[PDB]
């Protein structure tokens, strides 16, 4: 079984779930060369060692699986944040990582962000990291705590960047509407041409807001569901489960309460529906969640308590299976 961890990545093609990186206590990053594969249909794990341009071991990286080609951006290693971009073709032989020297201006070095996949584009939003090298489209807000306990200050951004896989070129779309505030540890989910984003941390709050960016027109929209909404949080997962539902699980509140609540956001109804499940005693923060082809949401890793208290952090290696559809 894979070692416990938080801040790893997990991506899938609906049947196989690829898990990489992250860190644990007793702190250290998990081995960079390992790639763990969970077969969603059988519940078994397989460890494969990779070669090539292996990325440094990181937490907070942002990854996707498109046609069984994995792509990884950003993260935080022993020497801080990065804006490097890697590809790992998993289709067919020893897997080889490829660090892509992209054209255009990359996003600033950062972690704890989100991404939407839409046709040939990978669209990245937000995150936490260094001051961008130059003034680009969007806003950056420093985290005042980063100036006293560090040699290099950091902050949040609301930046939207496209990595076009036709040419491996970075760009920023000109957006209309009001973008969500700069944030990190938010969660992104895509359904068709709508790139949803929920929650996240900004300044002294872990937020409860929900927006979508139209990935064809580049117009931002704020969603105002009526009635009861989930509590504000960061470090939660948001996973599309059908053409009309997003599944929300776990996270951490503004007042540092670990969460075990689950909800479905019904897009057509613009309404949140609380989801009953057998894991109320299993809150998770910084876990990952992948949808299977069987309607399930497979949650892995993450921490059961306040991982900000590193010596008491309860990092997990459990798989929690939510039967959503």
């Amino acid at each position: 079984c894979p070692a416990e961890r938080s801040g790893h990545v997990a991506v899938s093609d609906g049947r196989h779930m690829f898990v990489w990186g992250g860190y644990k206590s007793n702190d250290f990053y998990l081995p960079r060369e390992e790639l763990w594969i969970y077969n969603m249909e059988t519940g078994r794990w397989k460890k494969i060692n990779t070669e090539g341009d292996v990325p440094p071991s990181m937490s907070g990286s942002c990854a996707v699986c498109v046609d069984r080609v994995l792509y990884l951006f950003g993260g935080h290693h022993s020497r801080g944040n990065t804006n490097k971009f890697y590809m790992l073709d998993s289709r067919s032989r020893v897997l080889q990582w490829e660090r892509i020297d992209c054209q255009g201006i990359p996003p600033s070095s950062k972690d704890k962000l989100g991404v939407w996949v839409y046709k040939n584009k990978l669209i990245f939003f937000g995150g936490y990291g260094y001051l961008p090298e130059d003034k680009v489209l969007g806003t950056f807000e420093f985290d005042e705590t980063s100036f006293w306990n560090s040699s290099h200050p950091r902050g949040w951004n609301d930046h939207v960047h496209i990595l076009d896989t036709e040419t491996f070129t970075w760009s920023q779309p000109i957006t209309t509407g009001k973008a969500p505030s700069p944030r990190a540890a938010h969660a992104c989910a895509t359904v068709g041409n709508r790139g949803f984003v929920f929650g996240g941390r900004y300044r002294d709050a872990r937020m409860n807001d929900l927006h979508y960016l139209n990935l064809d027109t580049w117009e931002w929209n704020e969603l105002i569901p009526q009635g009861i909404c989930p509590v504000g949080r960061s470090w939660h997962s948001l996973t599309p489960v059908s053409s009309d539902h997003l599944f929300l699980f776990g996270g951490f509140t503004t007042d540092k309460q670990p969460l075990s609540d689950a909800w479905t956001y019904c897009i057509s109804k613009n309404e949140w529906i609380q989801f009953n499940h057998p894991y109320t005693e299993k809150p998770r923060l910084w876990h990952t969640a992948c949808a299977s082809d069987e309607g399930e949401v497979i949650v892995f890793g993450g921490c059961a308590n306040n991982l900000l208290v590193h010596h008491r952090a309860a990092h997990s290696n459990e798989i929690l299976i939510f039967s959503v559809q």
Partner: peptide, 7 residues
């Protein structure tokens, strides 16, 4: 640690 900041 530096890895958990900003969350």
């Amino acid at each position: 640690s530096n890895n958990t900041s900003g969350s």
